[PDB]
């Protein structure tokens, strides 16, 4: 409790799943949040169900839409203040090897998941500068960032791409003292509606030769550490890498 | 607050620096902890300075001491009742290059920083598996066990030993379904007494071709990722490594 | 010599520096060779300044045109016979940290560096399995995919986003018996023609803080790992990253 | 051919499997070699076997002996001239988890893999160092100083210790312009006479879930590289890891 006092949050596809995990862990440790998703009828359902307007509210929004994503900045400014923290959540995938994988499947999730995140970045960076806000940026990464699946291509090359533009971005603004830390987290597998809809999917996913802890996680196992990273507690803490994957990437 | 309730931790070399602040943090989250070291004087003093014999004493202890090791582990049971935390922190540093390491330099360094924490991850898996106390043992590495420094050379040998051999505990326990995780910790430059003894260490640490961020940290910023660890939060964490540098190796 | 007998490769972005190099030494080891580039007055001067047509021809491509590969696989497979090797080596930079980079700065990098190299990686495998070719892509990184910089974020993100899609084709060629290995490249500073049209850069380079040789590397130095990787030696190495940087991921 | 012409190399445990596989190639492309073993019956063959005594010799010499390795270096400058080349292969594995170690066995394994390794990096830097030799130290790690195996805790260690302590030395030589380079190879699982003797290992090793390729490499997959390190071919490279593994570390 109280471990985000004074925070104003941005949340990508905040509706469901991990991004509503984070966003309810948020809202209980005093920070304001402003969820995204494509649904309005499902987002303001989600916001009403973790809190009031004064605390959470709900913002139609696709990240891959660079003109919304300056909505949406001026939008959670209006409702909550300067924001401090933003969670690039957002994240599709398809699954195709690199060889099967169409120009426009290659296209749409690099929209989302590649310029998505670039584009909140940037823009973080340029609203959240110099304002002694103990701002922090929280890209979301994967397992699927540091090895490769041979059924993930373009999702892997996204994921990849993330975790190394985030240091840059982490570097250039420690360099300028800018007072805004960057950083990925790396989930590995996670029980979310999506896993529940396909059958066979957990188990298949919590076979020891996958998940050494034979079984998956659960979306508060990413909130918890997106409240260490967005709090003050992590003020030394910038262009790193958070795995939390059941020890995936450890053998 | 309340983060660690229940829990019965371990932390060597906790009398002073980084160490006591875990110590501290441990306490002030609901912790029971044994704090050890090498000075009773130092020691006694230091559990004094955090709280009362209910919540925190020291036990005189060189981590190289296998034997002891036992000892320590029986007084800390006798004191709390059974441990399910175990803080491997204690360490020490030769200032020269592999070229200029005396044999008697790399064993006695080797003694502490890597036979010692053997000792104390061999026994903590033995003494904690099975006994659903949500087990963690937190060994302490260091961004020089991800990148060479000239002049750390057996240093260097004995963190990366520590990174990768956590890594076989962590798969061991969780095939096993020990409930016991173990994870490593990679400070970077850190303010503690030490450094103030070694004029113009602290202004060549934070040069930003070191330290991009332009200073070092303090003993709260490992205390505070080390909190997460030992928590029931990071119950779907091991085998990783958890990095605060300060941008350090993000370069 | 005759390290190379019997492969036939295809080098993106061959007619200067690098890419000339690696092109050199693959025909000085008995490969058949196609090399592209921009401007054709440049790569047919390029290819006679090396060899005969019998052994290496210059094809007028930019790698982000996803038809012209298609043209350029049947151009070399009717001069030189089926495709054995593909560097994707072609690559452009722009000097701008996130916070600055314009979308379409954004967009045009990732076009070559990216999308360029995932339509050769594509068509490479469609086209170069199970044909008992002892096969090889190699794609050229940098040590930017390894670590940032916080004046090249579009790059850091293209070279991190190649790094692992990689892995994903590596796995899937080897899981599926395909005889394709891939594996990626990541060279530290190299003097090229470029570099020496920046007055200051190879000095700046060559600080000790940045390569601890105290000198940048020659376009050699790549020329020959990408030998052994197009090379039957290295057979049993797929997915993998091969460093030649002088020392500066070490640090 | 002549890829390492007037290389005076010392190989460790070169009298079986991957060594003798090295010390072949080396032979083969013009170097002039001293091979060690712990059985003068053994060595003396081994050596016979590949060349002449003007070619390669035999040195008895357990590598966890200090004392013996000047003895060494002594008795390969009288053979040969100046040593150029040291390959630090001799290694031994223990098939316990950290928990099942004992001390004993700990002590043992550190001895040979880790000392040893020490020993002959420190003195090979001291004899190579600033006599234009063109100088590389091969340390042989694995992929066990990548990641975990529950029942590898010891051999993790010290693949793991070796690894780093490796750039340690990378650095003080380069940053010296001593003309030292030093690397690490690592090796997945190769097949050899040992595990020839242990029905049913090679089939477990092959297991696509292991190896993605399907198979195990042979003792030429290490021989290969390490020719590349060896020669000038590599003389950019240094403080750096290569991994020939059949795709174990890319998933
Ligand atoms: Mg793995
Ligand atoms: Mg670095």
Request: aromatic share 8%; charged share 20%; proline share 3%.
């Amino acid at each position: 409790s109280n471990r985000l006092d004074g925070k104003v949050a941005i949340i990508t596809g905040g509706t469901l799943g991990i991004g509503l995990a984070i966003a309810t862990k948020f809202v209980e440790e005093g920070a304001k949040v402003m969820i995204t998703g494509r649904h309005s009828d499902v987002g303001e359902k989600a916001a009403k169900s973790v809190g009031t307007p004064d605390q959470i509210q709900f913002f139609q929004h696709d990240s891959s839409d660079e003109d919304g994503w300056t909505k949406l900045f001026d939008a959670t400014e209006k409702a909550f203040g300067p924001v401090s923290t933003l969670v690039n959540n957002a994240g599709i995938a398809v699954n195709k090897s690199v060889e099967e994988t169409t120009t426009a499947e290659w296209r749409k999730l690099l929209a989302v998941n590649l310029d998505g995140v670039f584009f909140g970045t940037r823009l973080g960076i340029q609203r959240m500068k110099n304002k002694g806000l103990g701002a922090s940026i929280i890209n979301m990464s994967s397992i699927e960032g540091f090895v490769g699946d041979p059924s993930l291509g373009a999702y892997n090359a996204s994921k990849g791409a993330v975790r190394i533009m985030s240091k840059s971005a982490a570097l250039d603004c420690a360099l300028k003292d800018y007072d805004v830390r960057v950083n990925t987290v790396h989930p590995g597998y996670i029980k979310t509606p999506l896993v529940d809809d396909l059958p066979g999917a957990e188990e298949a996913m919590s076979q020891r030769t996958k998940t050494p802890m034979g079984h998956i996680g659960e979306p508060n196992d990413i909130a918890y550490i997106c409240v260490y990273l967005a709090s003050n507690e992590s003020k030394f803490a910038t262009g790193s890498e958070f795995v939390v994957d059941g020890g995936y990437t450890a053998q």
